[PDB]
Amino acid sequence: QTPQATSPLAAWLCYLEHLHSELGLERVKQVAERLDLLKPAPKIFTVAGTNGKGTTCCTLEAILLAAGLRVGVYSSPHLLRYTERVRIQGQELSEAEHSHSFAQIEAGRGDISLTYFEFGTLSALQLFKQAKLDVVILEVGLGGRLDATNIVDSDVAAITSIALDHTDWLGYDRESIGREKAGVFRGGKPAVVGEPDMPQSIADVAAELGAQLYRRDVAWKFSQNGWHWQCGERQLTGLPVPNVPLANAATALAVLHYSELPLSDEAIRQGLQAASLPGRFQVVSEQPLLILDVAHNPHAARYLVNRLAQVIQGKVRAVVGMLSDKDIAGTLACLSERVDEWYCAPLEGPRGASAGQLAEHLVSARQFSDVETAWRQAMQDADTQDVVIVCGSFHTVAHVMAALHL
Numbered sequence: 560q561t562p563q564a565t566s567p568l569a570a571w572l573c574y575l576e577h578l579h580s581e582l583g584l585e586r587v588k589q590v591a592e593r594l595d596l597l598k599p600a601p602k603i604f605t606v607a608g609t610n611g612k613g614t615t616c617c618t619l620e621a622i623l624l625a626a627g628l629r630v631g632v633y634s635s636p637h638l639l640r641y642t643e644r645v646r647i648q649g650q651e652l653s654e655a656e657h658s659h660s661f662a663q664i665e666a667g668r669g670d671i672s673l674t675y676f677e678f679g680t681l682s683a684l685q686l687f688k689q690a691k692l693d694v695v696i697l698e699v700g701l702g703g704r705l706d707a708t709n710i711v712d713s714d715v716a717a718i719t720s721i722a723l724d725h726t727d728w729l730g731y732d733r734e735s736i737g738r739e740k741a742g743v744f745r746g747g748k749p750a751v752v753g754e755p756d757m758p759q760s761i762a763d764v765a766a767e768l769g770a771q772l773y774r775r776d777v778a779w780k781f782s783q784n785g786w787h788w789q790c791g792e793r794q795l796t797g798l799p800v801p802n803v804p805l806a807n808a809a810t811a812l813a814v815l816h817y818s819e820l821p822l823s824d825e826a827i828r829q830g831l832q833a834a835s836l837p838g839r840f841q842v843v844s845e846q847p848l849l850i851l852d853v854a855h856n857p858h859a860a861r862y863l864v865n866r867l868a869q870v871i872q873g874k875v876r877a878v879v880g881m882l883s884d885k886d887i888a889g890t891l892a893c894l895s896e897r898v899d900e901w902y903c904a905p906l907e908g909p910r911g912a913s914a915g916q917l918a919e920h921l922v923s924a925r926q927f928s929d930v931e932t933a934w935r936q937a938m939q940d941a942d943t944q945d946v947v948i949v950c951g952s953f954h955t956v957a958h959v960m961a962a963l964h965l
């Protein structure tokens with residue numbers, strides 16, 4: 560049975576998780592066109608990148624909300640609830656609102672077939688259209704050029720970082736990754752690049768499209784009390800350090816600058832003081848320090864290792880689970896520079912790695928039945944001066960979050 564407007568959101572998600580799968584955007588665009596969904600707000604920012612999309616978007620959101628605007632954010636993936644994926648004034652909507660919205664997409668599509676993410680994306684656009692917003696922030700699902708979020712013409716587009724989230728493959732490198740991401744840029748519009756080691760293909764695509772390229776360390780830059788953000792001969796000085804990676808706050812300032820939106824000193828500082836997301840180096844407890852971080856590739860792992868070195872005489876204990884298609888070998892080698900004790904767990908279903916698939920990269924790691932069991936063992940073993948880090952995937956962090964009923 561196809562669910563209805565009044566069915567539980569869980570029924571819609573089961574229907575969408577079975578959507579039988581086809582490359583372009585012509586289908587999703589045609590549905591959007593029918594439901595008049597291509598202009599959710601008069602200002603649209605679209606954010607691509609390997610790591611840093613979510614926290615870049617949340618910094619934009621925090622600043623724009625501090626400035627008194629009505630703001631929507633579309634985000635993915637989610638930790639515990641699908642309702643995390645759409646925020647309006649910083650807050651989630653009801654499950655009922657999502658079920659009604661999906662029903663409208665289902666009726667609106669006719670016999671045009673859509674993927675899970677295309678359906679989610681159209682529903683989000685519809686929820687935003689309805690909410691009378693000034694700005695909509697769209698986090699790219701994957702890539703950008705052919706991502707469902709790319710049906711909307713953005714006012715400013717951004718790439719937060721370039722890194723490899725998957726294993727070696729022919730033709731799969733920073734250049735190929737970059738090229739696909741740069742497909743969110745638009746002719747005549749600012750294209751903000753927050754990656755300091757930018758592949759050439761990003762510049763090639765920006766040139767083909769006629770986008771205006773504004774790169775970190777060329778057009779704008781930042782440093783380090785507080786921190787400083789500069790673009791040409793102008794700067795912001797003594798900014799508060801936010802609880803997101805500074806590169807991504809810097810990318811968000813660049814977006815906001817090139818958008819030409821009017822923003823007070825107060826809005827910028829209050830936003831930076833509020834900006835954070837659950838599961839991005841999130842301290843949940845102390846003595847032992849319990850930190851949750853959704854790092855799942857070597858680039859994020861390097862960031863996570865650098866933060867850990869700033870917070871630990873005590874041991875680092877890592878509770879880890881990953882998906883089987885990640886660069887497991889690389890992520891665990893990077894983490895192993897600072898992890899002293901390993902607690903490995905499987906993730907469920909056909910896409911999860913087993914604890915054995917993780918252990919085979921480590922030396923005499925502990926192996927457990929499931930994440931919660933691994934985590935309770937880690938807490939049980941931890942001394943007061945230890946750090947327990949839960950990482951490797953959303954599923955790992957979320958299993959711990961559900962177990963602490965956060």
Ligand SMILES: Nc1ncnc2c1ncn2[C@@H]1O[C@H](COP(=O)(O)OP(=O)(O)NP(=O)(O)O)[C@@H](O)[C@H]1O
Pocket residue numbers: 608609610611612613614615635636719720804806807839840852853854855858859860862863
């Ligand atoms: N600029 C960055 N450089 C290094 N690591 C980063 C950077 N931005 C984010 N990370 C790390 O990447 C992880 C996720 O950040 P996030 O902002 O959620 O990225 P995302 O692109 O939305 N990916 P996801 O977490 O899978 O939704 C956390 O470990 C971050 O610390």
Ligand SMILES: N[C@@H](CCC(=O)O)C(=O)O
Pocket residue numbers: 608609700701702703722723724725736
């Ligand atoms: N997986 C990324 C690209 C980066 C990568 O493949 O490593 C995406 O979201 O499109």
Ligand SMILES: [Mn+2]
Pocket residue numbers: 612613634635636698
């Ligand atoms: Mn994300």
